[PDB]
Design a protein around this ligand. Sequence first.
Ligand SMILES: [Mg+2]
Ligand SMILES: [Mg+2]
Ligand SMILES: [Mg+2]
Ligand SMILES: [Mg+2]
Ligand SMILES: [Zn+2]
Lengths: 267, 129, 102, 225, 64
Amino acid sequence: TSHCRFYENKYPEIDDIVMVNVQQIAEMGAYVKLLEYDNIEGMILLSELSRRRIRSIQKLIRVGKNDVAVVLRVDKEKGYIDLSKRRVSSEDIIKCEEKYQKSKTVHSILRYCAEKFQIPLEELYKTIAWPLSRKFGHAYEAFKLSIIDETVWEGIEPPSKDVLDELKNYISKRLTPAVKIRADVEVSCFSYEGIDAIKDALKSAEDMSTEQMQVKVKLVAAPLYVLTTQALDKQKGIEQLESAIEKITEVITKYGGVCNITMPPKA
Amino acid sequence: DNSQVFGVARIFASFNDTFVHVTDLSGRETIARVTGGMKVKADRDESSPYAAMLAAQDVAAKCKEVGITAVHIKIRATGGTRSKTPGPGGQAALRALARSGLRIGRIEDVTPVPSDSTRKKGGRRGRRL
Amino acid sequence: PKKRASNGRNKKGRGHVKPVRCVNCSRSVPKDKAIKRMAIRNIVEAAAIRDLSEASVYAEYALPKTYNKLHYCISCAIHARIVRVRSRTDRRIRAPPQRPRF
Amino acid sequence: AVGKNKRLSKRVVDPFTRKEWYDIKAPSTFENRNVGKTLVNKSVGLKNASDSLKGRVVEVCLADLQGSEDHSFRKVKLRVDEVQGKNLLTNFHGMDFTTDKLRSMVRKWQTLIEANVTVKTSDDYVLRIFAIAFTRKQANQVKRTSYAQSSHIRQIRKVISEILTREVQNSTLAQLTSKLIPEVINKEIENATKDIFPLQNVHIRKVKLLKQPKFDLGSLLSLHG
Amino acid sequence: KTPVTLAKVIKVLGRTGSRGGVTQVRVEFLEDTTRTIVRNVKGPVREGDILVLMESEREARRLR
RNA sequence: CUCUAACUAUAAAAAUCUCUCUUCUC
Ligand SMILES: [Mg+2]
Ligand SMILES: [Mg+2]
Ligand SMILES: [Mg+2]
Ligand SMILES: [Mg+2]
Ligand SMILES: [Zn+2]
């Protein structure tokens, strides 16, 4: 029971960019289904099909696959779509490819949710997806902040709480990303004692490791020491590793040696 | 003189993507620049007469909205060094502006004709389509 | 073999003539081998005069005409049907096509 | 209709409810002093509109200005000079033909003569004027062309230059326009040239205003009520 | 705004088109006896039929 | 045996080609 379109209104809009699964081709193109809005079909017309000249009709369509699309005039009376494929900007295709995949994942999760709860998708998107899209602009960003922050479900009225529990479990299992921020610090020392200073630096860099983020400067060479961190929020590893670099500098400036940075902390 | 507040439509009709652009008598104040490529999708048909009717009808609607009732016409080809000949579409735009309510008078052509200068683009042997 | 006794140029006693660009393909051609048509037309087509006639201020307006010559390279003149590929004994007839309507 | 890239490198309003209307007045020289309307952005201090209006020029046919149709091919450009509030004046800025009449006169088998001259008015209005004449086929001519000699052309150009210089240097530009509208200089040129060569369709063209002394408030007031 | 108009053909202006399967005719509107317009037609017509035009003023020309 | 008025509006791409040449006298 797959239904319940991705965005606010059932019908396409003015100059909107979508994507289409194609099934059938009669004479003037293909009146074929959508999977960005409900499940309605639309005309792709041959004069407005491809950039090159239309040499073949079978190759460029690829029945049963995903394709770019733009709607010109929406038949907001009965459910018809006039649709285009040629006039989508090269930068526009890829950004819609995002929007489309963005929309698809939320449905992929809430499908599993409905099929396991046998509640029609319409009610689930009504109760959950639409308030999330209203609050955060995208249900995908709402899901990501749900992984981080629990307060995303406050102000929402699920049809049942077990839906929330299983959705949270499935999102923590499937939508799990902890980005590895890594850096390299070059020891350019020529000084008196360097290995004791390095041990002190490693201890002072490793005792700082928190419960959630643990920093281990691993060895791959003498000058080049590698700093690996698991940034849970993609914004704390930077400050951790900057503090680490400051502490390395505090170490090196007085024993006699010198060190330099080769790569700073990067995601 | 029954208070026909006047305008100048100034259709510029090229061999592609004609223009309709109604402005005041001095020409300083624009009203509904809206053009030929505004309302057609092919980008090949921008010169087509249908583009002319569509552009003309919407600019006439804006003309009634603002208040202009009577219009003088400045028909202009590309002119200059290019082809001196009015665009295929613009004539249809003239017809539409005649039709849709607007009163018309004082038809003029203002195609810029040069006095033989600015060597025309194309080389000696010219376009060799 | 000399195709045309008049050499197909119409210069005949001038040395050299200034060139003029073709109107379609912009090929420069001597201003005499520069097949040329008086494109005189009413600014509005006769098919649409009536709409103008009964929906216009200035009762009995002039309805002016637009004037311009057209200069073609002979390639365009032949392809765009301005000039036909006539027969031999019919080449030496220079009178225009019998005043199209009279 | 789309195919956009929007290389940009909604606070929308109704830009025409925020606008005023103003009247146009022609000088006392012509018959119908009223010209028409003009839309203007609303006059606010710090860019008062009356600053913007002074300098506007409007191209108007002489047929409307005179009612008659024989002035159809003429064309006068009037410059906005004085603003009175909801109503503004105009002074003469230039004269010209409709291109279509010019082309209708320009025919084959009759050479055209042009006379160009820069002349200073009686008051200060530094002008440039042009004159166009065509040889006239005689009343009995079987000769298929009506060409004029080069010497005849030189003499005719000199005559027309002298007549134009006289007419402009006589009177002020207000009186000059009052001479222009009856096109009396045309009959004068034909008078002084009909002995040399017939010269059909003599016409004074492209009266171009180049310089103006300061403002001349009083005369402008005299030209409008 | 459904201006479905009717025009009785008053004269047939030959047959055009690369296929040759289209016919251009002069049609005079059933109402407004004044106006006539030239338009294309697909399928056989003879002097007196009533073309059902959605659109009125799109006067097409000879077609290649 | 009296005369000089009409008019429109197309172009994408297409390379190459192995033989075998043979009488007119009544
Ligand atoms: Mg070719
Ligand atoms: Mg010699
Ligand atoms: Mg020739
Ligand atoms: Mg090979
Ligand atoms: Zn050419």
